[PDB]
Design a protein around this ligand. Structure first.
Ligand SMILES: O=P(O)(O)O[C@H]1[C@H](OP(=O)(O)O)[C@@H](OP(=O)(O)O)[C@H](OP(=O)(O)O)[C@@H](OP(=O)(O)O)[C@H]1OP(=O)(O)O
Lengths: 90, 567
């Protein structure tokens, strides 16, 4: 692998332009982007659950804080969604 | 990438978390909506079907609630609304892959059931909780057609009991039943068809029978389903015979996964002991229908150390509750119902002490519904101090406005102690003599309260004001027979946009206040529900029979009957 049973976990593998040596080392030892690129289901699950745990119970503002997302909602739009969420779907 | 975000979201299934993710940015909004699996609509008139379907195109599970709680006390006249058909019709075109429909206090018709059966091939779960409007013919359509059905749960529904033949419509190829609750049905199902159904359904885990299945036939069914986790018996009466009792005992003992027992209509004390083999691992016992006396209840309860939920008639008495308190240390919920609610003098020795005993003895007790004839402030204070973990507390004193029977004072300070000490109390129902002061306490202390029910209490609008001004977490307020009118409602109008709904019946709210509230708050539906003819036929100052107010993004509804007016 350039950055048998161990290799075959990856359905992509089953020469890796999109994985770094440092990250590949971790993948073998066993990130989200590599787990997705190499199509390794269990690593995807572990990593995606870990990410989901960073989101659970957090406010929209805390979420884009822990991540690095900007609020692209106009104040009108954000109020309309929040209202629909709370009045109809909670 | 999108495919990773969608996978991250697959691990997020809480409604509030879903809504939170939908608001972080426009991209998350879009990815989130396209993979949302379930919607929970707590007020069917808060939003239109079309809005739901277009936002969340890939939903497989829908839950809808219609009439508000006081429908249970027959305070919502027939025909008020809560029609599910518009929802079934809209979904029938769009939610091809729909699997679960859970409805509560909705009007559901045989046309609804027929359309469900015909439109949703993958249909698996139907829960009709306190619904009305359909018959065993609609049930027959579901049985005949829903090849993949896993749950048919009719709890507390009012069904037109045309005939028990409906159940014979499940075909011989049908094997997928997991949960069947027919306890509300008066009509007798074919027992042979029922036995054949149970036999061919290896994943059947919950079977709640109707009364028409006699006790002498129960062991037969249990032998066919030894994997059952929940059983609701049918009738629980027979001539007392050793062979019947022994057959029942063996069959019950062969059900090693049984954890929840209910039914017990007409229960004969001689046959209760057959369940004792179960007792040791039982976590829910519903003895609401059994009119058996305290000592017999006590013999059963003595050997249920794992019990977590008990529903029982007041026949348990204070002495039975003292036993429960020492025996069942994992109890979480206790409901004690009245055996003779239309008799003012006590027919059983059940008082405040029973509830005090359980509050002292059961450290995990957090949900109480308790019907009794007498109460004291001292008892309520002891309960609050003992159980600061209480989350749902509903006390129903049979006599309206009964004071503390020892001091003759209102129960203001006792309920005050409940809201002061129980910091995570989310539901409260009040009764007994109560002044505006109890509402002052509620306003000051009940900061986590979400649902408050009030009847025959308070002195003036100031009481209702303290609640609307103070109760930060309030979602549902329901009021009957209180001297609350125009002033608190209008002064706190904006609070109403933060709540699912407000219900007020037989209070002092004038027609003129309802008109003005409707003018001020266009995003509220303010519904005057009055059977005396057009409200404009009486002076504006005349109190309306009922007003039901709820926030909505859908605006005035299109299905109001002639006795409902939207302001
Ligand atoms: O969260 P809500 O929409 O306010 O629902 C509550 C909640 O039931 P759900 O399981 O549907 O969330 C209550 O559960 P509790 O915590 O009080 O035990 C239930 O009470 P019951 O346990 O007696 O079923 C009560 O139902 P109800 O008002 O019929 O007592 C019901 O409120 P809804 O009236 O809005 O369904």
């Amino acid at each position: 692998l350039k950055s048998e049973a161990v290799a075959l976990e990856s359905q992509t593998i089953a020469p890796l332009p999109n994985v770094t040596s440092k990250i590949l080392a971790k993948v073998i030892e066993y990130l989200i982007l590599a787990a997705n690129y190499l199509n390794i289901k269990n690593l995807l699950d572990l990593t995606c659950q870990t990410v989901a745990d960073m989101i659970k119970g957090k406010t929209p503002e805390e979420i884009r804080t822990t991540f690095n997302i900007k609020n692209d909602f106009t104040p009108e739009e954000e109020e309309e969604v929040r209202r629909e969420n709370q009045w109809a779907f909670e | 990438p999108e495919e990773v975000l969608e996978h991250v979201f697959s691990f997020i299934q809480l409604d509030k978390d879903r809504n939170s993710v939908s608001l972080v940015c426009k991209s998350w909004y879009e990815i989130e909506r396209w993979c949302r699996r379930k919607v929970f609509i707590g007020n069917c008139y808060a939003v239109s079907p079309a809005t739901v379907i277009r936002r969340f195109p890939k939903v497989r599970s829908v839950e809808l609630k219609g009439k508000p709680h006081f429908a249970d006390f027959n305070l919502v006249p027939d025909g008020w609304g809560g029609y599910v058909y518009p929802w079934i019709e809209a979904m029938s075109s769009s939610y091809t892959w729909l699997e679960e429909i859970r409805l509560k206090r909705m009007v559901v018709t045989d046309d609804c059931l027929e359309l469900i059966a015909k439109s949703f091939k993958n249909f698996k779960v139907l829960v009709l909780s306190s619904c009305e409007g359909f018959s065993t013919d609609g049930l027959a359509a579901i049985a005949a057609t829903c090849r993949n059905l896993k749950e048919l749960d009719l709890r507390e529904s009012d069904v037109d009991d045309v005939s028990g033949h409906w159940l014979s419509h499940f075909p011989d190829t049908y094997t997928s039943l997991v949960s069947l609750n027919i306890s509300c049905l008066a009509s007798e199902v074919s027992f042979s068809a029922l036995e054949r159904l149970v036999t061919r359904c290896p994943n059947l885990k919950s079977l709640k029978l109707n009364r028409a299945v006699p006790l002498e036939k129960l062991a037969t069914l249990l032998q066919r389903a030894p994997q059952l986790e929940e059983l609701g018996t049918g009738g629980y009466t027979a001539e007392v015979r050793p062979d019947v009792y022994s057959g029942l005992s063996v069959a019950l003992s062969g059900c090693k996964e049984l954890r929840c027992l209910s039914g017990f209509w007409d229960a004969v004390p001689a046959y209760l002991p057959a369940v004792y083999s179960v007792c040791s691992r039982l976590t829910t016992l519903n003895l609401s229908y059994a009119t058996v006396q305290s000592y017999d209840l006590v013999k059963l309860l003595c050997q249920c150390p794992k019990l977590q939920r008990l529903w029982v008639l007041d026949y348990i008495e204070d002495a039975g509750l003292e036993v429960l308190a020492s025996t069942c240390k994992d109890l979480r919920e206790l409901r004690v119902f009245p055996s003779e609610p239309f008799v003012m003098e006590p027919n059983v020795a059940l008082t405040e002490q029973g509830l005090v005993s359980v509050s002292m003895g059961c450290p995990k007790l957090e949900s109480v519904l308790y019907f009794c004839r007498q109460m004291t402030n001292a008892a309520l204070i002891t309960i609050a101090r003992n159980r600061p973990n209480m989350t749902r507390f509903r006390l129903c004193i049979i006599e309206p406005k009964a004071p503390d029977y020892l001091t003759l004072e209102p129960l203001d300070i006792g309920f005050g102690a409940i809201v002061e000490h129980c910091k995570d109390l989310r539901r409260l129902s009040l009764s007994g003599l109560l002044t505006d002061k109890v509402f002052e306490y509620i306003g000051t202390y009940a900061k986590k309260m979400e649902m408050l029910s009030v009847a025959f209490a308070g002195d003036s609008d100031l009481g209702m004001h303290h609640v609307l001004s103070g109760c930060d977490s309030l979602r549902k307020l329901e009021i009957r027979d209180c001297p609350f009118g125009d002033k608190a409602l209008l002064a706190n109008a904006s609070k109403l946009e933060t709540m699912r709904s407000l219900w007020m019946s037989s209070c002092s709210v004038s027609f003129g206040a309802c008109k003005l509230l409707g003018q001020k708050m266009p995003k509220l539906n303010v519904e005057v529900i009055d059977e005396r003819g057009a409200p404009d036929s009486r002076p504006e100052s005349c109190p309306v029979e009922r007003v039901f107010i709820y926030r909505t993004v859908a605006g005035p509804r299109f299905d109001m009957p002639g006795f409902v007016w939207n302001m």
